[PDB]
Structure 1
């Protein structure tokens, strides 16, 4: 099992990653996010500065890379530590309160450990980004919390989503959206509304997010009714773990090929800011996989395990990624 990852994309890391990691650890200790020192050590152990420094490896301002890096840490923390992990009614309200604290500086925590921390991140994002960029992050942020709400709903009932619902869900629950909405904030490069919201750019962003979500599901086979591509396929298709491992890799490789074919057609015409955003998507895909396999020599697959130029069978909710009349 576990054949090497197909990832023919640029790998790079911010030359100031060590300095930014140092500050992030310091922020985390004063963040009051986590109860014990033992937990904070888990949050530090995510090496989320190493991670987000692979997405924005030429960020001119160490401060913007630090601010965005902080959210990746806050992100892990929020998701791991729960009592709410099969209590969707309570989570719906937590989600609402936390999302509100992101949009309303005046909002008060109510002994919620996470809120003041998020509110510090938000204060940073307003210092750096335009109100437009902040809203892009806020909206992405709620998108993610809708994903998590969906996933927690499923856990409560013991619902194993099928392929369509599972892929739809993970675009959101895996944190891809708020992660990519921080590119602009890290780099400074304000992508205009006309370009950022082209269907073709939306598709590329989702495809980037979906490959990262599937790389993460693969990364979580290093441990049975947990919600992941493997369980989904074993349930709905009657496959063995090994057969589903091969199917997962076929699907994921097909999405990545589409991402590269659409990138190859969009990028030539892209303006400077969109081009920088699109390099982030690529640096992100590769950075995720690389960060997941941790300077030991790493093996990659030279070819994909499936190169069908058409949409995924059984996943109509993503078929539009392949429809060029609806895009560019």
Structure 2
């Protein structure tokens, strides 16, 4: 059981309570969350604590954006736990609508709640951001939206992919590097490109994102398996290795542990790398904060998922015999 699994990872943002108030008003104003069942269900996820634990460097309005972005991810995600997630062409068309917002085509007044919420998050994200950050993060959003239809293809196939194909789909649908781009933005830093593209930081970024989605795969397996989801590390290992469920969970834990070890080995090289690049003291401080942002995403996501009611509650309040939401908020 998830309660008997810990992964071996290493504060919390002071704005948690203020962000809880803002975010509750925001999801209602945008129409992303309604009244009654959806609202109590949304509240039980505790999106503010995810923001405050996953992005502890964020303060004030920056933490508000983190929580609102998380709200969009989770509400949008669940819209595919139903007929949409078994209809790849329809999923691709819906996600093309969202992608158009990324690249400039504003949704306009009266658009659906998911389009309006995304447009608000994206506008707030890019306001005052460095153009290199905007370009990279725009392509990250594109991958996230485009990957959803491939998860639907895999559901229809009914077998897990091999490891390489699992990673290609799962890294996309998990939000790719978007949590780290968000944490960088919310911390108010800009990583110098020379450091960002070092082999060390590129490997570390990929490792941190893998760690969180794999930790999620383990804890979210119960609600996903009954829905015919196929892009879950435990199912991929079990199918590839012809092993028991316990053997597959053990191997999944090992995939997380080796990535944490790699991350921490490379982190020790970062001061020396900054010196070899001749970065300024301010730049080195921003790189140090970027390291903390990655570390806190890994440790803080796990801290959140052990206390949330999303994964223990989903099989009971939204059983697999019906859709995985109370209200359709995404027109298809």
Distance 1:218 1:109 in 2: 40
- What secondary structure is seen at the aligned counterpart in 1 of 2:84? coil
Partner of 1:309: none
- Paired residues of 2:177 and 2:209 also in contact (CA < 8 A): yes
Deviation readout 1:78-135 (Å, 9 max, x if unpaired): 0102331011111112112102113326443774321111111122123342333233
Partner of 1:190: 190
Which residues of structure 1 form unaligned runs of 5+? 296-328
- Paired residues of 2:55 and 2:66 also in contact (CA < 8 A): no
Partner of 1:311: none
Displacement of 1:244 in angstroms is 0.9
- What secondary structure is seen at the aligned counterpart in 2 of 1:19? helix
Displacement of 1:49 in angstroms is 2.0
Distance 2:20 2:14 in 1: 12
Displacement of 1:206 in angstroms is 0.9
Distance 2:297 2:124 in 1: 22
Is 1:293 matched with 2:306?
yes
- TM-score normalised over the length of structure 2: 0.81
Distance 1:48 1:173 in 2: 19
Distance 1:48 1:135 in 2: 27
- The 5 Å alignment of 1:1-328 reads 3-9=4-10, 12-34=11-33, 36-59=35-58, 61-81=59-79, 82-104=82-104, 106-108=106-108, 111-223=111-223, 224=225, 225-227=228-230, 228-270=232-274, 271-294=284-307
Which residues of structure 2 form unaligned runs of 5+? 275-283, 309-332
- Paired residues of 2:57 and 2:293 also in contact (CA < 8 A): no
Displacement of 1:56 in angstroms is 2.7
Q: Which segment is superposed worse, 249-258 or 72-81? A: 249-258
Instruction: Give the number of equivalent residue pairs.
Output: 292
Distance 1:109 1:208 in 2: 38
Displacement of 1:22 in angstroms is 1.2
Displacement of 1:44 in angstroms is 3.0
Q: Which segment is superposed worse, 161-170 or 220-229? A: 220-229
Displacement of 1:35 in angstroms is 5.3
Distance 2:18 2:105 in 1: 29
- Paired residues of 1:162 and 1:236 also in contact (CA < 8 A): yes
- What secondary structure is seen at the aligned counterpart in 1 of 2:54? coil
Deviation readout 1:262-305 (Å, 9 max, x if unpaired): 1222244342222211111101101011111109xxxxxxxxxx
- What secondary structure is seen at the aligned counterpart in 2 of 1:7? coil
Deviation readout 1:37-92 (Å, 9 max, x if unpaired): 42233233322221122233133x41122112211110000010233101111111
Distance 1:267 1:145 in 2: 36
- Paired residues of 1:154 and 1:160 also in contact (CA < 8 A): yes
Distance 2:261 2:129 in 1: 32
Displacement of 1:184 in angstroms is 2.0
